[PDB]
Protein backbone atom coordinates (compact mmCIF):
# COMPACT_ATOMS: atom_id res chain seq x y z
CA UNK A 1 0.00 0.00 0.00
CA UNK A 2 2.50 2.60 1.15
CA UNK A 3 4.75 2.09 -1.85
CA UNK A 4 1.62 2.80 -3.93
CA UNK A 5 1.18 6.14 -2.13
CA UNK A 6 4.82 7.24 -2.04
CA UNK A 7 4.79 6.99 -5.86
CA UNK A 8 1.59 9.05 -6.01
CA UNK A 9 3.00 11.70 -3.65
CA UNK A 10 6.25 11.72 -5.67
CA UNK A 11 4.50 12.55 -8.95
CA UNK A 12 2.38 15.30 -7.41
CA UNK A 13 5.11 17.34 -5.79
CA UNK A 14 7.44 16.60 -8.66
CA UNK A 15 4.72 18.53 -10.51
CA UNK A 16 5.33 21.52 -8.16
CA UNK A 17 1.59 22.30 -8.08
CA UNK A 18 1.99 25.69 -6.34
CA UNK A 19 4.01 27.35 -9.11
CA UNK A 20 1.38 27.07 -11.82
CA UNK A 21 0.41 30.29 -13.56
CA UNK A 22 -3.29 29.71 -12.83
CA UNK A 23 -3.95 27.37 -9.91
CA UNK A 24 -7.42 25.80 -10.23
CA UNK A 25 -7.52 23.74 -7.02
CA UNK A 26 -11.33 23.47 -7.08
CA UNK A 27 -11.44 21.49 -10.31
CA UNK A 28 -9.48 18.67 -8.61
CA UNK A 29 -12.36 18.01 -6.20
CA UNK A 30 -13.85 14.51 -6.51
CA UNK A 31 -16.74 14.08 -4.00
CA UNK A 32 -16.74 10.32 -4.78
CA UNK A 33 -13.32 9.60 -3.23
CA UNK A 34 -14.18 10.64 0.35
CA UNK A 35 -12.58 8.12 2.79
CA UNK A 36 -14.91 5.76 4.62
CA UNK A 37 -12.61 5.72 7.67
CA UNK A 38 -10.48 8.25 9.52
CA UNK A 39 -9.37 8.78 13.10
CA UNK A 40 -11.67 11.24 14.82
CA UNK A 41 -10.09 11.29 18.31
CA UNK A 42 -6.93 9.88 19.89
CA UNK A 43 -5.33 9.50 23.35
CA UNK A 44 -1.60 8.79 23.67
CA UNK A 45 -0.92 6.91 26.91
CA UNK A 46 1.99 5.02 25.34
CA UNK A 47 4.38 5.53 28.31
CA UNK A 48 1.99 3.35 30.35
CA UNK A 49 -0.29 1.38 28.00
CA UNK A 50 -0.49 2.54 24.39
CA UNK A 51 -2.50 4.58 21.90
CA UNK A 52 -6.27 4.90 22.23
CA UNK A 53 -8.25 6.16 19.24
CA UNK A 54 -11.79 6.57 17.87
CA UNK A 55 -12.78 5.81 14.31
CA UNK A 56 -15.18 8.07 12.46
CA UNK A 57 -17.97 5.45 12.75
CA UNK A 58 -17.70 5.72 16.60
CA UNK A 59 -15.77 2.48 16.94
CA UNK A 60 -12.69 2.70 19.18
CA UNK A 61 -9.40 0.81 19.29
CA UNK A 62 -6.20 0.48 21.29
CA UNK A 63 -2.70 -0.31 20.02
CA UNK A 64 -1.05 -1.62 23.19
CA UNK A 65 2.64 -1.14 23.98
CA UNK A 66 3.10 -4.88 23.32
CA UNK A 67 1.83 -4.31 19.74
CA UNK A 68 -1.41 -6.14 20.41
CA UNK A 69 -4.60 -4.46 19.16
CA UNK A 70 -8.12 -4.53 20.58
CA UNK A 71 -11.08 -3.02 18.65
CA UNK A 72 -14.58 -2.24 19.90
CA UNK A 73 -17.30 -2.00 17.25
CA UNK A 74 -19.86 0.78 17.37
CA UNK A 75 -22.38 -1.79 18.61
CA UNK A 76 -20.54 -1.60 21.95
CA UNK A 77 -20.23 -5.40 22.12
CA UNK A 78 -18.23 -7.01 19.31
CA UNK A 79 -14.48 -7.06 19.84
CA UNK A 80 -11.66 -7.90 17.48
CA UNK A 81 -8.28 -8.88 18.99
CA UNK A 82 -5.13 -8.90 16.87
CA UNK A 83 -1.97 -10.46 18.24
CA UNK A 84 1.49 -9.12 17.36
CA UNK A 85 1.83 -11.59 14.46
CA UNK A 86 -1.53 -10.47 12.96
CA UNK A 87 -3.60 -13.44 14.18
CA UNK A 88 -7.22 -12.23 14.34
CA UNK A 89 -9.88 -13.37 16.83
CA UNK A 90 -13.52 -12.33 17.26
CA UNK A 91 -14.85 -11.87 20.78
CA UNK A 92 -17.61 -9.97 22.60
CA UNK A 93 -17.67 -8.02 25.88
CA UNK A 94 -20.55 -10.34 26.86
CA UNK A 95 -18.88 -13.74 26.14
CA UNK A 96 -15.14 -13.08 26.42
CA UNK A 97 -11.98 -14.73 27.79
CA UNK A 98 -10.88 -13.67 31.24
CA UNK A 99 -7.26 -13.37 30.11
CA UNK A 100 -8.25 -10.11 28.36
CA UNK A 101 -9.99 -8.46 31.33
CA UNK A 102 -7.20 -5.92 31.89
CA UNK A 103 -7.06 -4.89 28.22
CA UNK A 104 -10.86 -4.63 28.00
CA UNK A 105 -11.09 -2.36 31.03
CA UNK A 106 -8.23 -0.29 29.57
CA UNK A 107 -10.19 -0.01 26.33
CA UNK A 108 -13.26 0.99 28.36
CA UNK A 109 -11.21 3.69 30.07
CA UNK A 110 -10.07 4.99 26.66
CA UNK A 111 -13.64 5.06 25.29
CA UNK A 112 -14.99 6.81 28.40
CA UNK A 113 -12.20 9.39 28.31
CA UNK A 114 -12.79 10.15 24.62
CA UNK A 115 -16.57 10.41 25.17
CA UNK A 116 -16.24 12.96 27.97
CA UNK A 117 -13.22 15.03 26.91
CA UNK A 118 -12.75 15.20 23.19
CA UNK A 119 -14.00 16.69 19.97
CA UNK A 120 -14.82 14.24 17.17
CA UNK A 121 -12.93 15.24 14.02
CA UNK A 122 -14.75 15.64 10.71
CA UNK A 123 -18.14 15.09 12.31
CA UNK A 124 -19.92 16.94 9.48
CA UNK A 125 -18.70 14.46 6.82
CA UNK A 126 -21.05 11.67 5.67
CA UNK A 127 -18.58 8.86 4.73
CA UNK A 128 -15.96 -1.89 3.79
CA UNK A 129 -14.11 -3.91 6.45
CA UNK A 130 -13.38 -2.30 9.80
CA UNK A 131 -9.72 -1.18 10.00
CA UNK A 132 -7.23 -1.23 12.90
CA UNK A 133 -4.24 1.02 13.61
CA UNK A 134 -1.18 -0.64 12.01
CA UNK A 135 1.43 1.82 13.27
CA UNK A 136 1.82 5.42 14.45
CA UNK A 137 4.43 8.00 15.45
CA UNK A 138 4.67 11.59 16.61
CA UNK A 139 6.96 14.49 15.80
CA UNK A 140 6.96 17.93 17.37
CA UNK A 141 4.39 19.18 14.83
CA UNK A 142 2.19 16.20 13.86
CA UNK A 143 0.98 12.70 14.72
CA UNK A 144 1.00 10.13 11.88
CA UNK A 145 -1.57 7.32 11.82
CA UNK A 146 -1.48 4.39 9.39
CA UNK A 147 -4.65 2.25 9.12
CA UNK A 148 -4.80 -1.33 7.96
CA UNK A 149 -6.70 -0.38 4.80
CA UNK A 150 -3.61 1.49 3.58
CA UNK A 151 -4.72 4.98 4.64
CA UNK A 152 -2.26 7.42 6.23
CA UNK A 153 -3.53 10.38 8.30
CA UNK A 154 -1.51 13.34 9.65
CA UNK A 155 -2.90 15.65 12.38
CA UNK A 156 -0.99 18.92 12.80
CA UNK A 157 -0.93 20.14 16.46
CA UNK A 158 -0.60 23.71 15.30
CA UNK A 159 -3.72 24.72 13.39
CA UNK A 160 -5.61 21.42 13.75
CA UNK A 161 -5.39 20.88 10.00
CA UNK A 162 -5.48 17.25 8.96
CA UNK A 163 -4.41 15.22 5.93
CA UNK A 164 -5.89 11.85 4.95
CA UNK A 165 -4.12 9.88 2.21
CA UNK A 166 -5.83 6.90 0.51
CA UNK A 167 -3.63 4.84 -1.84
CA UNK A 168 -6.58 2.90 -3.30
CA UNK A 169 -8.58 5.97 -4.47
CA UNK A 170 -5.35 7.96 -5.19
CA UNK A 171 -6.83 10.77 -3.16
CA UNK A 172 -5.98 13.18 -0.34
CA UNK A 173 -8.56 14.69 1.99
CA UNK A 174 -7.57 18.05 3.52
CA UNK A 175 -9.33 19.49 6.59
CA UNK A 176 -8.32 23.14 6.90
CA UNK A 177 -8.25 25.40 9.95
CA UNK A 178 -11.99 26.27 9.89
CA UNK A 179 -12.82 22.51 9.65
CA UNK A 180 -13.98 22.53 6.01
CA UNK A 181 -13.10 19.34 4.20
CA UNK A 182 -12.17 18.84 0.56
CA UNK A 183 -11.20 15.59 -1.15
CA UNK A 184 -8.98 15.60 -4.24
CA UNK A 185 -7.64 13.14 -6.78
CA UNK A 186 -3.86 13.31 -6.62
CA UNK A 187 -3.63 13.30 -10.43
CA UNK A 188 -5.98 16.27 -10.68
CA UNK A 189 -3.80 18.29 -8.30
CA UNK A 190 -1.05 17.27 -10.70
CA UNK A 191 -2.78 19.25 -13.48
CA UNK A 192 -4.65 22.13 -11.83
CA UNK A 193 -2.27 22.83 -8.95
CA UNK A 194 -2.81 23.70 -5.33
CA UNK A 195 -2.35 26.23 -2.53
CA UNK A 196 1.02 26.79 -0.94
CA UNK A 197 -0.26 25.62 2.48
CA UNK A 198 -1.45 22.28 1.03
CA UNK A 199 1.73 21.92 -1.05
CA UNK A 200 3.72 22.49 2.16
CA UNK A 201 1.80 19.68 3.87
CA UNK A 202 2.01 17.31 0.90
CA UNK A 203 5.76 17.83 0.94
CA UNK A 204 5.76 16.93 4.65
CA UNK A 205 3.59 13.87 4.02
CA UNK A 206 6.21 12.44 1.65
CA UNK A 207 8.74 12.51 4.50
CA UNK A 208 6.36 10.88 7.01
CA UNK A 209 5.51 8.18 4.47
CA UNK A 210 9.06 7.14 3.66
CA UNK A 211 9.48 7.04 7.45
CA UNK A 212 6.58 4.58 7.57
CA UNK A 213 8.08 2.54 4.72
CA UNK A 214 11.38 2.36 6.64
CA UNK A 215 9.59 0.94 9.76
CA UNK A 216 8.98 -2.38 7.96
Amino acid sequence: HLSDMLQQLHSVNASKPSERGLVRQEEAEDPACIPIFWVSKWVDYSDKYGLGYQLCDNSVGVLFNDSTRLILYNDGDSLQYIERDGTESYLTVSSHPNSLMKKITLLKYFRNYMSEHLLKAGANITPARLPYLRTWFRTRSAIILHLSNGSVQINFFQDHTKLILCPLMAAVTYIDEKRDFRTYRLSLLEEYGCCKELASRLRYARTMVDKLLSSR
Binding site: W42, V43, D44, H117, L118, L119, A121, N155, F157
Partner: peptide, 7 residues
Amino acid sequence: PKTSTPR
Protein backbone atom coordinates in the same frame (compact mmCIF):
# COMPACT_ATOMS: atom_id res chain seq x y z
CA PRO B 1 -0.33 17.32 23.66
CA LYS B 2 -1.20 13.98 25.25
CA THR B 3 -4.58 13.74 23.46
CA SER B 4 -6.31 14.99 20.32
CA THR B 5 -8.38 18.21 20.38
CA PRO B 6 -10.59 18.50 23.49
CA ARG B 7 -14.01 20.25 23.61
